[PDB]
Write a protein that binds this ligand. Sequence first.
Ligand SMILES: [Co+2]
Ligand SMILES: [Co+2]
Lengths: 229, 229, 203, 203
Amino acid sequence: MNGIHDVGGMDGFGKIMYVKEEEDTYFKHDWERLTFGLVAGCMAQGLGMKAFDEFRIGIEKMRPVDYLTSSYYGHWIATVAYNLLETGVLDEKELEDRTQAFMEKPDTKIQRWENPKLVKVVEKALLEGLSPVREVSSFPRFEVGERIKTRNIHPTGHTRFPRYVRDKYGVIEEVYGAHVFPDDAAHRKGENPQYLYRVRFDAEELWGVKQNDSVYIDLWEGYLEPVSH
Amino acid sequence: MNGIHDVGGMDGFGKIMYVKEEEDTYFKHDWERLTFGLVAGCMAQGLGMKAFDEFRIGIEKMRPVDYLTSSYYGHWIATVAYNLLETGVLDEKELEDRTQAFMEKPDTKIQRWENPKLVKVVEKALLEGLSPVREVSSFPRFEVGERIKTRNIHPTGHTRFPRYVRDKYGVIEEVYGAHVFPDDAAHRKGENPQYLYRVRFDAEELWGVKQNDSVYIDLWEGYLEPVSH
Amino acid sequence: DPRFPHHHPRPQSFWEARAKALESLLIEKRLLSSDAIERVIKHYEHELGPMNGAKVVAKAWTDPEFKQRLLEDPETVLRELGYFGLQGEHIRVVENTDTVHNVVVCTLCSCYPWPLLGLPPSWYKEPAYRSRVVKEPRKVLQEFGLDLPDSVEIRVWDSSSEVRFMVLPQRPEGTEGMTEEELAQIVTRDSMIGVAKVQPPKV
Amino acid sequence: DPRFPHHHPRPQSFWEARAKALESLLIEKRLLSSDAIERVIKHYEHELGPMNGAKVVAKAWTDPEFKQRLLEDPETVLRELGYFGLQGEHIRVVENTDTVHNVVVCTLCSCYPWPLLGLPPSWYKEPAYRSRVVKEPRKVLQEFGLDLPDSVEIRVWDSSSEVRFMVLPQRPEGTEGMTEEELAQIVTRDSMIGVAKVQPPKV
Ligand SMILES: [Co+2]
Ligand SMILES: [Co+2]
């Protein structure tokens, strides 16, 4: 979707708040640390999220004002809740009451519970990862060195086809192989693998200005089309 | 600029809050009515704003979070303040202190002052308008019926060249004549008239989808370029 | 927080306080009078309204010659009627037909022909309408209760220049016999923007 | 207000309350344990960090064979070193040269190779950097204090797929004689993202 998250090329966001790495703190609040666990915990078990595709769409669906105002880990919370509701893991009214409860008395303690069984599962995910590489029988359409042209399409659902590179000419730099197709996997429509390519674009083609700059990006075969003659 | 105001084609803003016209109130608060006066009052006298070009840029320069959160008339207030500061009509510290003062005690009354002289000026503007039509010696590059191609440029300053129509092919529908060029007038660089054209675009060319829909828009000659052969 | 300033928006009270701060400053410095600020409010809140455009539609609905004059050289015709003014200096009238439907918008801001229809609707200046009307006008129209066939071409007019556009709707199939003044009463503001059609006075 | 819901953002407390509401619910339903939630925090806050990538850079800075192996088949080389894991399954290493400079980003979200550099910088996930780095990388780099000549090509790498990228900076002209472990200490996190160059240990 052409949402607020696709900020590539926009103006008005001001200067970068640069900070020294030895002073840039990871988590400032405890709920932020909690969120990371909540995210990694569910995805490891496949609760509401098999991989990161279903995770990114949840964020993209946020209201523009919430996306810009909530903190970074606010995005993570929104998607985890989105996915757990969607997949029916948790009930709408069920979550609303708890949220309100914790807004009333934030100091409320939670019953601690543990079991090394799940912990072992989470570790498996953190160390083995979730490679989106798959095997297909299709023959890739383009080859390294070939001049390509991104398609002019505006999908309504999730997509990794940023607006600043649509309807533009580029050159294939590499053929990675076949990877899970975001546009489908994110909407639970089946991970329908597609050849992934790294395409190089010149600043002139993207911004209409001759500068010695270039952008490299990975695009799925479904986003590209051959150059007409 | 490619700011948050150029929302054409974006997704995620949700459903339209439709309301019956007999129930859709103009101003809900007094400060909103005040703002309208403040805007029309300054522009009529050329205080900080000669026309609407300098007025729109002021809004476009707002911070994204302020643009989405402040109300509609919040935008008007931001630009009026922006322009009055820029043109040195009012001092930065001077305005800050007053703002804070009124946030402390909003009930503070203001000394009323009047003079039919200015009132007559404001009426002149409201009834005569500010036609941006000018006379030039240049020969228009394109003619009605000609197939055109919008240029792929991303100006940093003000511009009336919305992103959803850049680097796209269209057809000239009319040649209005020469009008003040926003990109320059908005930045006080001189109203450098340019031929204005109304260009028609097909849904397919803009969104890559065949539908019986089309968009008509007015573009300055400086945004267009001839079709190569 | 200190590295995330953009996450916090200024409170609605800030803008209100700013408007007052501006009013006092301009007055105090004798740059703007109070009777001038009122003249404007009175003019846009009680003097201008959709009633003006309604009369134009009614006259064209009953005078083929006027209609032609209006569609060919609208700027001149409107000037004679007196419907001219700030943000209404250059206006074009687009006509709806059985096969063509028109809808105007201002994706960049909220440009609207004040001298003709008065101030714009609340939804007209918001992102929802402005962002979607140019890409999928059919869906947007359904939300307004207008379901158009696929055989009907939809023309979206985006006000990118100082030029403004007004929609001339079709005369409902229930009128006939009604007078000009009686027809002006049935033309709605939304019908002149293209988000609705004038309903037949039959019922 | 009732017609302008989108103007009001949910308060920061809402998100905090929501995270807790989620934690209790998942625990209460025996879907997620507390010792599992801690294992993760411990792993991303105390186990992973830029220190990993620093060693890779230091080894390549001192072993031409390793460097070659690394640039040609990075996925295999990294797997042998053990720098593999969630969001670090597929990594590519881009090398900076006297005529070429590399800078990575994730315009759509904030994708970063956790197993190699740990969590990303605060500015890396914000709109300012993500929006501008692809259109005018030179200006953005100046803000970080890096002024590159026009004769130096700047390559921006946007992480649109699960594939992640890491920047291999040039060895400063002040080292020589230093050991691998001693070089790993001078490689900064920012230098492996492309927003800075390793400064010479001379001074
Ligand atoms: Co406007
Ligand atoms: Co990301």
